[PDB]
Short mmCIF file of C-alpha atoms and ligand atoms in Angstrom, two decimals:
data_model
loop_
_atom_site.label_atom_id
_atom_site.label_comp_id
_atom_site.label_asym_id
_atom_site.label_seq_id
_atom_site.Cartn_x
_atom_site.Cartn_y
_atom_site.Cartn_z
CA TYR A 1 -25.18 5.44 -19.65
CA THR A 2 -23.26 7.47 -17.03
CA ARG A 3 -24.81 4.85 -14.62
CA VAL A 4 -22.12 2.99 -12.60
CA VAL A 5 -22.85 -0.58 -11.52
CA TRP A 6 -21.10 -1.31 -8.15
CA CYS A 7 -20.35 -4.88 -7.06
CA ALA A 8 -21.39 -5.71 -3.52
CA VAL A 9 -19.80 -8.73 -1.76
CA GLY A 10 -22.50 -10.53 0.21
CA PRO A 11 -25.82 -9.36 1.54
CA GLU A 12 -24.72 -6.70 4.08
CA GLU A 13 -22.79 -4.89 1.39
CA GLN A 14 -25.78 -5.36 -0.97
CA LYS A 15 -28.09 -3.59 1.55
CA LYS A 16 -25.62 -0.69 1.83
CA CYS A 17 -25.25 -0.46 -1.90
CA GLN A 18 -29.04 -0.45 -2.40
CA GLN A 19 -29.19 2.55 0.04
CA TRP A 20 -26.47 4.35 -1.89
CA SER A 21 -28.27 3.58 -5.18
CA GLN A 22 -31.61 5.03 -3.84
CA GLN A 23 -29.82 8.16 -2.56
CA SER A 24 -27.82 8.65 -5.76
CA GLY A 25 -31.07 8.54 -7.83
CA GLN A 26 -29.70 5.42 -9.54
CA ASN A 27 -26.51 7.17 -10.74
CA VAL A 28 -25.07 4.09 -8.98
CA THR A 29 -26.80 0.74 -9.07
CA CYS A 30 -25.83 -2.66 -7.53
CA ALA A 31 -24.79 -6.06 -8.59
CA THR A 32 -24.02 -8.57 -5.82
CA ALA A 33 -21.91 -11.71 -5.60
CA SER A 34 -20.96 -13.98 -2.69
CA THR A 35 -17.19 -13.45 -2.83
CA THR A 36 -14.69 -10.87 -4.05
CA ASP A 37 -13.47 -13.16 -6.77
CA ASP A 38 -16.97 -13.55 -8.06
CA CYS A 39 -17.36 -9.75 -8.17
CA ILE A 40 -14.06 -9.51 -10.13
CA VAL A 41 -15.63 -11.99 -12.64
CA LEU A 42 -18.75 -9.86 -12.91
CA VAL A 43 -16.63 -6.81 -13.71
CA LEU A 44 -14.62 -8.82 -16.27
CA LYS A 45 -17.86 -9.82 -17.93
CA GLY A 46 -19.09 -6.23 -17.99
CA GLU A 47 -22.00 -7.07 -15.67
CA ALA A 48 -20.61 -4.75 -13.00
CA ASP A 49 -18.31 -1.77 -13.32
CA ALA A 50 -16.26 -1.44 -10.14
CA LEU A 51 -15.60 -2.33 -6.53
CA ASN A 52 -13.06 -1.45 -3.84
CA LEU A 53 -10.38 -4.02 -3.25
CA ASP A 54 -7.67 -4.98 -0.80
CA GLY A 55 -4.23 -5.03 -2.44
CA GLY A 56 -4.16 -8.92 -2.66
CA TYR A 57 -7.43 -8.78 -4.60
CA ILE A 58 -6.00 -5.97 -6.78
CA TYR A 59 -3.29 -8.42 -7.78
CA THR A 60 -5.96 -11.00 -8.87
CA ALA A 61 -7.95 -8.30 -10.66
CA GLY A 62 -4.95 -6.77 -12.33
CA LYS A 63 -3.64 -10.05 -13.67
CA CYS A 64 -7.03 -10.19 -15.40
CA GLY A 65 -6.70 -6.68 -16.89
CA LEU A 66 -8.63 -4.57 -14.40
CA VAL A 67 -6.98 -1.23 -13.43
CA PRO A 68 -6.85 0.88 -10.24
CA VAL A 69 -9.05 4.05 -10.45
CA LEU A 70 -8.98 5.84 -7.01
CA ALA A 71 -7.50 4.80 -3.66
CA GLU A 72 -8.81 5.01 -0.12
CA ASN A 73 -7.03 7.78 1.80
CA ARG A 74 -7.40 7.86 5.57
CA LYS A 75 -6.42 10.76 7.94
CA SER A 76 -2.70 11.62 7.49
CA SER A 77 -0.01 13.64 9.31
CA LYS A 78 2.31 15.30 6.63
CA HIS A 79 0.79 17.15 3.54
CA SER A 80 -2.18 18.66 5.53
CA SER A 81 -2.24 21.64 3.09
CA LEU A 82 -3.18 19.20 0.27
CA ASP A 83 -6.85 18.30 -0.20
CA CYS A 84 -7.59 14.63 0.58
CA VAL A 85 -8.38 13.87 -3.05
CA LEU A 86 -4.94 15.10 -4.16
CA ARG A 87 -2.88 13.74 -1.33
CA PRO A 88 -0.48 10.71 -2.00
CA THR A 89 -1.67 7.65 -0.08
CA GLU A 90 0.50 6.41 2.80
CA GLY A 91 -0.06 2.67 3.05
CA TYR A 92 -1.25 0.94 6.22
CA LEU A 93 0.69 -1.17 8.63
CA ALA A 94 0.18 -4.97 8.57
CA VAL A 95 0.54 -6.27 12.13
CA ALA A 96 0.35 -9.47 14.12
CA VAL A 97 -1.70 -9.03 17.29
CA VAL A 98 -1.91 -11.23 20.37
CA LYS A 99 -3.28 -10.90 23.91
CA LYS A 100 -0.84 -9.48 26.52
CA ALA A 101 -1.99 -12.29 28.87
CA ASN A 102 -0.74 -14.92 26.38
CA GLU A 103 2.74 -14.34 27.65
CA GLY A 104 5.77 -15.62 25.79
CA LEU A 105 3.90 -16.04 22.48
CA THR A 106 6.20 -14.33 19.98
CA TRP A 107 6.72 -14.46 16.19
CA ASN A 108 9.11 -17.27 16.81
CA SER A 109 6.65 -19.45 18.65
CA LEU A 110 3.68 -19.27 16.26
CA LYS A 111 3.97 -22.80 15.02
CA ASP A 112 0.97 -24.95 16.14
CA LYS A 113 -0.95 -21.96 17.51
CA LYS A 114 -4.47 -20.85 16.45
CA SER A 115 -4.65 -17.98 13.90
CA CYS A 116 -7.25 -15.49 12.72
CA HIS A 117 -6.93 -14.06 9.14
CA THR A 118 -9.01 -11.41 7.36
CA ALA A 119 -9.37 -13.85 4.35
CA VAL A 120 -7.16 -15.91 2.04
CA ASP A 121 -5.52 -13.68 -0.60
CA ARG A 122 -5.73 -10.42 1.40
CA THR A 123 -2.63 -8.35 2.24
CA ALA A 124 -2.32 -8.12 6.01
CA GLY A 125 -4.47 -11.12 6.65
CA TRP A 126 -2.70 -13.58 4.41
CA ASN A 127 -0.13 -12.57 1.77
CA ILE A 128 2.26 -10.83 4.13
CA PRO A 129 2.20 -13.26 7.13
CA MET A 130 1.99 -16.41 5.07
CA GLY A 131 4.62 -15.21 2.62
CA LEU A 132 6.91 -14.53 5.58
CA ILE A 133 6.15 -17.88 7.21
CA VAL A 134 6.72 -19.88 3.98
CA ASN A 135 10.06 -18.08 3.51
CA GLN A 136 11.21 -18.52 7.08
CA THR A 137 10.10 -22.20 7.36
CA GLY A 138 11.39 -22.96 3.83
CA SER A 139 8.14 -24.91 3.40
CA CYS A 140 5.06 -24.45 1.19
CA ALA A 141 2.83 -26.42 3.58
CA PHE A 142 1.40 -23.21 5.04
CA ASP A 143 -1.85 -25.15 5.70
CA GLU A 144 -0.04 -27.13 8.33
CA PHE A 145 1.65 -24.37 10.23
CA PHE A 146 -1.05 -23.24 12.62
CA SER A 147 -3.03 -26.00 14.41
CA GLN A 148 -6.34 -24.40 13.50
CA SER A 149 -7.30 -21.10 11.83
CA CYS A 150 -10.14 -18.92 10.54
CA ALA A 151 -8.97 -17.96 7.01
CA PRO A 152 -12.18 -17.20 5.06
CA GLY A 153 -12.04 -18.60 1.56
CA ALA A 154 -10.16 -21.72 2.37
CA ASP A 155 -11.75 -25.20 2.17
CA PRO A 156 -14.46 -25.25 4.93
CA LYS A 157 -13.49 -28.80 6.02
CA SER A 158 -9.86 -27.93 6.49
CA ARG A 159 -7.95 -26.76 9.49
CA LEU A 160 -7.66 -23.34 7.88
CA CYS A 161 -11.49 -22.87 8.46
CA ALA A 162 -11.79 -24.78 11.75
CA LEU A 163 -12.17 -21.62 13.84
CA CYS A 164 -14.56 -19.86 11.51
CA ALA A 165 -18.14 -19.43 12.85
CA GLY A 166 -20.44 -18.68 9.90
CA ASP A 167 -23.53 -16.41 10.30
CA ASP A 168 -26.10 -15.86 13.08
CA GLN A 169 -27.52 -19.36 12.22
CA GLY A 170 -24.15 -20.96 11.92
CA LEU A 171 -24.39 -21.29 8.07
CA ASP A 172 -21.84 -20.04 5.55
CA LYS A 173 -18.83 -21.05 7.78
CA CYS A 174 -15.64 -19.67 6.29
CA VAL A 175 -17.29 -17.75 3.44
CA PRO A 176 -15.13 -14.71 2.47
CA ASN A 177 -17.74 -12.18 3.08
CA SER A 178 -19.10 -10.15 6.05
CA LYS A 179 -21.73 -12.90 6.91
CA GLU A 180 -18.84 -14.92 8.40
CA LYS A 181 -18.49 -13.64 11.99
CA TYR A 182 -14.67 -13.70 11.78
CA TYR A 183 -14.31 -12.18 8.27
CA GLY A 184 -12.20 -9.15 7.45
CA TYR A 185 -10.21 -6.89 9.69
CA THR A 186 -12.96 -6.55 12.33
CA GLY A 187 -13.84 -10.31 12.23
CA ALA A 188 -10.22 -11.44 12.57
CA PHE A 189 -9.67 -9.01 15.45
CA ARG A 190 -12.97 -10.32 17.08
CA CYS A 191 -11.56 -13.89 16.66
CA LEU A 192 -8.55 -12.85 18.78
CA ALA A 193 -10.62 -10.72 21.23
CA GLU A 194 -12.89 -13.73 21.96
CA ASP A 195 -9.81 -16.02 22.38
CA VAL A 196 -10.86 -18.22 19.50
CA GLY A 197 -7.36 -17.64 18.06
CA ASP A 198 -3.98 -16.81 19.59
CA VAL A 199 -2.94 -14.35 16.87
CA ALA A 200 -4.74 -12.13 14.41
CA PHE A 201 -3.26 -10.75 11.19
CA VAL A 202 -4.81 -7.38 10.69
CA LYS A 203 -3.71 -3.74 10.35
CA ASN A 204 -2.71 -1.31 13.04
CA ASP A 205 -5.88 0.80 12.63
CA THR A 206 -8.20 -2.17 13.42
CA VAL A 207 -6.66 -2.52 17.01
CA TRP A 208 -7.24 1.19 17.73
CA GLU A 209 -10.68 1.46 16.20
CA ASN A 210 -12.08 -1.52 18.13
CA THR A 211 -10.73 -0.74 21.63
CA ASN A 212 -11.15 1.85 24.42
CA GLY A 213 -14.73 2.71 23.48
CA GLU A 214 -13.90 3.44 19.80
CA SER A 215 -16.41 0.77 18.96
CA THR A 216 -19.70 0.36 20.87
CA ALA A 217 -20.32 -2.95 19.26
CA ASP A 218 -21.14 -5.71 21.73
CA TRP A 219 -17.97 -7.76 21.38
CA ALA A 220 -15.71 -4.69 21.21
CA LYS A 221 -17.23 -2.28 23.62
CA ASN A 222 -15.29 -3.46 26.60
CA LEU A 223 -11.85 -4.21 24.98
CA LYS A 224 -8.78 -2.32 26.32
CA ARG A 225 -5.82 -1.54 24.14
CA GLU A 226 -3.40 -2.39 26.87
CA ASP A 227 -4.64 -6.00 26.87
CA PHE A 228 -3.08 -6.46 23.36
CA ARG A 229 0.41 -6.66 22.05
CA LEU A 230 2.03 -6.61 18.58
CA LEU A 231 4.50 -9.33 17.50
CA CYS A 232 7.66 -7.86 15.93
CA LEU A 233 9.74 -9.82 13.40
CA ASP A 234 12.82 -9.75 15.70
CA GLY A 235 10.97 -11.93 18.23
CA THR A 236 9.91 -9.04 20.66
CA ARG A 237 6.40 -7.93 21.74
CA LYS A 238 5.37 -4.30 21.88
CA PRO A 239 2.38 -2.23 22.93
CA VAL A 240 0.02 -1.34 20.18
CA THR A 241 1.36 2.29 20.23
CA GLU A 242 4.53 1.01 18.63
CA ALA A 243 3.23 -0.23 15.29
CA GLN A 244 5.65 2.00 13.37
CA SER A 245 8.50 -0.08 14.79
CA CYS A 246 6.70 -3.44 15.10
CA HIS A 247 4.88 -4.35 11.83
CA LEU A 248 5.17 -7.05 9.20
CA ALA A 249 4.91 -4.75 6.17
CA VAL A 250 3.47 -1.56 4.84
CA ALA A 251 0.48 -2.43 2.60
CA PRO A 252 -0.80 -0.43 -0.36
CA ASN A 253 -4.19 1.15 0.41
CA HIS A 254 -7.41 -0.51 -0.70
CA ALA A 255 -8.46 0.87 -4.08
CA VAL A 256 -11.30 0.93 -6.56
CA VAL A 257 -10.74 -1.15 -9.68
CA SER A 258 -12.61 -1.27 -13.01
CA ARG A 259 -12.20 -2.37 -16.56
CA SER A 260 -9.90 -0.17 -18.31
CA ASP A 261 -12.58 0.97 -20.71
CA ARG A 262 -14.82 2.21 -17.89
CA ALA A 263 -12.17 3.73 -15.59
CA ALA A 264 -12.63 7.28 -16.59
CA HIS A 265 -16.30 7.18 -16.12
CA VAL A 266 -16.15 5.33 -12.80
CA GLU A 267 -13.64 7.92 -11.59
CA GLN A 268 -15.84 10.90 -12.51
CA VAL A 269 -18.96 9.42 -10.94
CA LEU A 270 -17.18 8.51 -7.71
CA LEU A 271 -15.59 11.92 -7.34
CA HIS A 272 -19.16 13.35 -7.55
CA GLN A 273 -20.62 10.70 -5.28
CA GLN A 274 -18.11 11.36 -2.45
CA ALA A 275 -18.84 15.11 -2.75
CA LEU A 276 -22.38 14.14 -1.77
CA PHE A 277 -21.89 11.24 0.63
CA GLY A 278 -18.22 11.27 1.65
CA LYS A 279 -16.64 12.48 4.88
CA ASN A 280 -17.80 16.12 4.77
CA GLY A 281 -20.28 15.28 2.02
CA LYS A 282 -23.25 17.54 1.29
CA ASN A 283 -25.69 14.79 2.31
CA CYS A 284 -23.60 13.00 4.97
CA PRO A 285 -24.77 12.34 7.73
CA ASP A 286 -28.16 13.81 6.87
CA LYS A 287 -29.04 11.23 4.18
CA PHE A 288 -26.29 8.66 3.57
CA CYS A 289 -22.58 8.20 4.40
CA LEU A 290 -20.58 6.19 1.85
CA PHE A 291 -17.73 5.60 4.33
CA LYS A 292 -19.70 4.39 7.35
CA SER A 293 -21.13 1.03 8.20
CA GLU A 294 -21.12 0.64 11.99
CA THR A 295 -17.43 -0.55 11.85
CA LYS A 296 -18.22 -3.35 9.46
CA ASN A 297 -16.14 -1.82 6.61
CA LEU A 298 -18.85 -2.44 4.07
CA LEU A 299 -17.96 -1.28 0.44
CA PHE A 300 -15.15 0.91 1.91
CA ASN A 301 -13.17 0.97 5.16
CA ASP A 302 -15.02 2.99 7.75
CA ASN A 303 -11.80 5.00 8.36
CA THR A 304 -11.80 6.31 4.78
CA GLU A 305 -11.62 10.18 4.54
CA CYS A 306 -11.88 10.18 0.73
CA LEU A 307 -11.06 8.32 -2.46
CA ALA A 308 -7.96 9.98 -3.86
CA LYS A 309 -6.58 10.40 -7.34
CA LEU A 310 -3.73 8.28 -8.34
CA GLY A 311 -0.45 9.88 -9.56
CA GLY A 312 1.19 8.54 -12.71
CA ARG A 313 -1.81 6.65 -14.13
CA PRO A 314 -0.45 3.54 -12.52
CA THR A 315 -0.72 -0.02 -13.69
CA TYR A 316 -1.80 -2.48 -11.00
CA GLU A 317 1.85 -3.50 -10.52
CA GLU A 318 2.97 0.08 -10.14
CA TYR A 319 0.13 0.77 -7.61
CA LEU A 320 0.91 -2.39 -5.51
CA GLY A 321 4.68 -1.80 -5.78
CA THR A 322 7.35 -4.17 -7.09
CA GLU A 323 8.31 -5.47 -3.49
CA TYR A 324 4.70 -6.58 -2.86
CA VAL A 325 4.04 -8.00 -6.29
CA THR A 326 7.22 -10.10 -6.06
CA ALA A 327 6.16 -11.28 -2.48
CA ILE A 328 2.80 -12.43 -3.86
CA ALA A 329 4.19 -14.14 -6.89
CA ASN A 330 6.57 -16.11 -4.66
CA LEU A 331 3.81 -17.14 -2.28
CA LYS A 332 1.52 -18.22 -5.14
CA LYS A 333 4.35 -20.56 -6.32
CA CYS A 334 3.10 -22.77 -3.36
CA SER A 335 -0.41 -23.40 -4.62
CA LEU B 1 3.82 -15.49 -13.81
CA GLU B 2 1.27 -14.99 -16.68
CA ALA B 3 -2.48 -15.83 -16.55
CA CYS B 4 -5.69 -14.42 -15.26
CA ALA B 5 -7.04 -16.94 -12.64
CA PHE B 6 -10.51 -17.14 -14.41
C1 LIG C 1 -2.48 3.14 14.23
O1 LIG C 1 -3.85 3.34 13.92
C2 LIG C 1 -4.55 4.36 14.64
C3 LIG C 1 -5.99 4.38 14.18
O2 LIG C 1 -6.02 4.82 12.85
C4 LIG C 1 -3.83 5.75 14.48
O3 LIG C 1 -4.40 6.64 15.41
C5 LIG C 1 -5.11 7.73 14.80
O4 LIG C 1 -4.17 8.65 14.27
C6 LIG C 1 -4.67 9.96 13.92
C7 LIG C 1 -3.48 10.81 13.51
O5 LIG C 1 -2.92 10.11 12.42
C8 LIG C 1 -5.42 10.61 15.08
O6 LIG C 1 -5.95 11.88 14.74
C9 LIG C 1 -6.55 9.67 15.43
O7 LIG C 1 -7.23 10.27 16.48
C10 LIG C 1 -6.00 8.30 15.89
N1 LIG C 1 -7.13 7.42 16.13
C11 LIG C 1 -7.39 6.78 17.28
C12 LIG C 1 -8.64 5.94 17.29
O8 LIG C 1 -6.71 6.85 18.29
C13 LIG C 1 -2.40 5.54 14.88
O9 LIG C 1 -1.67 6.67 14.47
C14 LIG C 1 -1.75 4.46 13.99
N2 LIG C 1 -0.31 4.19 14.27
C15 LIG C 1 0.61 4.30 13.33
C16 LIG C 1 2.02 4.09 13.82
O10 LIG C 1 0.41 4.52 12.13
C1 LIG C 2 10.04 -14.44 0.17
O1 LIG C 2 11.33 -14.79 -0.39
C2 LIG C 2 11.56 -14.36 -1.74
C3 LIG C 2 12.97 -14.87 -2.19
O2 LIG C 2 13.92 -14.19 -1.39
C4 LIG C 2 11.40 -12.82 -1.85
O3 LIG C 2 11.47 -12.50 -3.26
C5 LIG C 2 12.52 -11.49 -3.44
O4 LIG C 2 12.24 -10.20 -2.99
C6 LIG C 2 13.21 -9.16 -3.27
C7 LIG C 2 12.64 -7.82 -2.78
O5 LIG C 2 11.45 -7.48 -3.47
C8 LIG C 2 13.70 -9.09 -4.73
O6 LIG C 2 14.95 -8.39 -4.77
C9 LIG C 2 14.05 -10.50 -5.16
O7 LIG C 2 14.43 -10.47 -6.53
C10 LIG C 2 12.95 -11.53 -4.91
N1 LIG C 2 13.38 -12.87 -5.20
C11 LIG C 2 12.74 -13.79 -5.93
C12 LIG C 2 13.37 -15.14 -6.12
O8 LIG C 2 11.66 -13.64 -6.51
C13 LIG C 2 10.06 -12.30 -1.19
O9 LIG C 2 9.96 -10.89 -1.08
C14 LIG C 2 9.85 -12.93 0.21
N2 LIG C 2 8.48 -12.74 0.68
C15 LIG C 2 8.24 -11.91 1.67
C16 LIG C 2 6.82 -11.71 2.09
O10 LIG C 2 9.13 -11.20 2.26
C1 LIG C 3 11.23 -3.17 9.57
C2 LIG C 3 10.23 -3.50 8.46
C3 LIG C 3 10.44 -4.88 8.19
C4 LIG C 3 9.76 -5.58 7.21
C5 LIG C 3 8.82 -4.85 6.49
CL1 LIG C 3 7.85 -5.64 5.17
C6 LIG C 3 8.64 -3.50 6.83
N1 LIG C 3 7.74 -2.77 6.14
C7 LIG C 3 8.05 -1.56 5.40
C8 LIG C 3 8.48 -0.44 6.15
C9 LIG C 3 8.70 0.80 5.58
C10 LIG C 3 8.47 0.96 4.20
C11 LIG C 3 8.00 -0.09 3.44
C12 LIG C 3 7.78 -1.36 4.00
C13 LIG C 3 7.26 -2.40 3.05
O1 LIG C 3 6.81 -3.45 3.51
O2 LIG C 3 7.24 -2.07 1.73
C14 LIG C 3 9.40 -2.67 7.71
CL2 LIG C 3 8.72 -1.41 7.74
C1 LIG C 4 -26.71 12.05 -11.26
O1 LIG C 4 -25.83 12.29 -12.34
C2 LIG C 4 -26.07 13.46 -13.18
C3 LIG C 4 -25.09 13.53 -14.37
O2 LIG C 4 -23.74 13.70 -14.02
C4 LIG C 4 -26.05 14.71 -12.33
O3 LIG C 4 -26.59 15.77 -13.12
C5 LIG C 4 -26.90 14.50 -11.07
O4 LIG C 4 -26.56 15.62 -10.30
C6 LIG C 4 -26.50 13.20 -10.31
N1 LIG C 4 -27.20 13.05 -9.04
C7 LIG C 4 -26.87 12.33 -7.91
C8 LIG C 4 -27.88 12.55 -6.83
O5 LIG C 4 -25.94 11.47 -7.70
FE1 LIG C 5 -6.14 -5.01 3.40
ZN1 LIG C 6 3.44 3.97 -15.08
#
């Protein structure tokens, strides 16, 4: 009854979760759905217990009564005394990234260009840049701004999915899961690296982790950081070292959500599971690492050091922050 | 403001 049912989004996450379930001696077991929204429905129905979510998905889940349990914490700079599990999270930087060779593309000349998004409804990929664009254009027709896009989750016949590529067989175009070649932070950055799009909306860490040999994956292995620039809201372009002064927003960290009635038990099982399979886990890398997936960010971001306790038993609006919840609410007025 | 999407 202490068994926790994780929800895997698509078949790559399902494989990873089945490995975790075998290694955990079924203390964790797996349900799978094709999209994050479908996993949120399985948790609402009580057919799964928990999954990790981007902050835009935490807004969907929290409007439905699910609660944040633990947050991803990556490597920090201040508070190094404090154990990872007890350290306040820092947010991550939402950025707009372009190629250096695409000279004279700036924030102010994005109209009619090609865009790459992590997925509809996600923080850096969609809520932050589209919220900003709707506000600045004074128009809700955000499906007409870029000439073509990959925005997984949108209608596959629309311009918002025109650049999406589907799976190895070219099926599942635009699905919001890792089967879509251009899904998520890594897929939207690959869409820009391959010059399918002109801009990608990702986070600062994705640029660094997929350049300069930080990834050995085939499409990333030869990318150089200096070949990219960030688009700043004042119309300037900066090197990717300057994200602290050239971002679109600071996003709340991805976090595990559950029904309120199972939160305490999900929390206790995850704190034990990361002791085993987390960053310096007893059985990681020997048997299984919960926070690696060959850069694919399956079930958790690969840069995750631990899942950390939340201060103040926060509601989902307190965890997201009032600035971000208000930004989302305004954007969702459009559709 | 107020409704779960499902
Ligand atoms: C942008 O993201 C990168 C990748 O996470 C950050 O660089 C890492 O920062 C830590 C210290 O915080 C270093 O120990 C790592 O070695 C760095 N990683 C890599 C791959 O270089 C970078 O700090 C972030 N920039 C900002 C402004 O937050
Ligand atoms: C888009 O514009 C709206 C309207 O200005 C912004 O909503 C406001 O945000 C501030 C800061 O959180 C609050 O003081 C206001 O009360 C909000 N106004 C309204 C009418 O709701 C929103 O933040 C902007 N979106 C983005 C991404 O910046
Ligand atoms: C200059 C600038 C302009 C617009 C935003 Cl959204 C941001 N982002 C933030 C920066 C620091 C702290 C919080 C935020 C935020 O988005 O809540 C900054 Cl940093
Ligand atoms: C499974 O959970 C039980 C109860 O908390 C614990 O005794 C056991 O150590 C756990 N094992 C693993 C491998 O996750
Ligand atoms: Fe995110
Ligand atoms: Zn509170």
